Amino acid sequence: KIVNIGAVLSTRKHEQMFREAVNQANKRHGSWKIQLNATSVTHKPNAIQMALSVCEDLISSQVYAILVSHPPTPNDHFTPTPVSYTAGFYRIPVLGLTTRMSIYSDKSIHLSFLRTVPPYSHQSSVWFEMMRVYSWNHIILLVSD
């Protein structure tokens, strides 16, 4: 019944809409089997401390799927890696939606992690999609690595 689906998110305001969202989810596919619960804690400062919390709080409540977003204020220096690691053990799928640098793409260092935000590598697909119909084919490439 209590199919916990956690979502580690940004500050309380950005986490506010979840308790409203779950009620709509609990109502649409409603039955006496899918009475979900929501447990969430913001992106704590530092990394090891939050990695403790995700086991101290989230799976300590025996959760079933994890949702993760970007830290509100800082840059992509400390994107949440341990979520893909702490949940990496039990091979539970983890859903990201905004964090995006294309390192997470390959399912070799992060096992199973799907994103609703597409990494910048798709620009190459977009670049192809327009250079086809532009009357030019030969192209020079410059990029860091």
């Binding site: 689906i5 809409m17 899918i34 799976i59 025996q62 949702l67 905004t98 620009q123």
Partner: protein, 48 residues
């Protein structure tokens, strides 16, 4: 120069809605499946 820009960007509410809808449908299918292992107490103790 050729600029570029995405549609949604910082619109996490719609992403949350779509994600929870997809997950709800998937778990509604999942509840009608084989044995579902009860998630453990957490990190402490069990490492199966």
């Amino acid at each position: 120069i050729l600029g570029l820009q995405l549609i949604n960007g910082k619109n996490e509410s719609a992403h949350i809605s779509d994600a929870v809808g997809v997950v709800a449908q998937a778990v509604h299918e999942l509840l009608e499946k084989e044995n579902i292992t009860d998630p453990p107490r957490g990190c402490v103790g069990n490492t199966n």
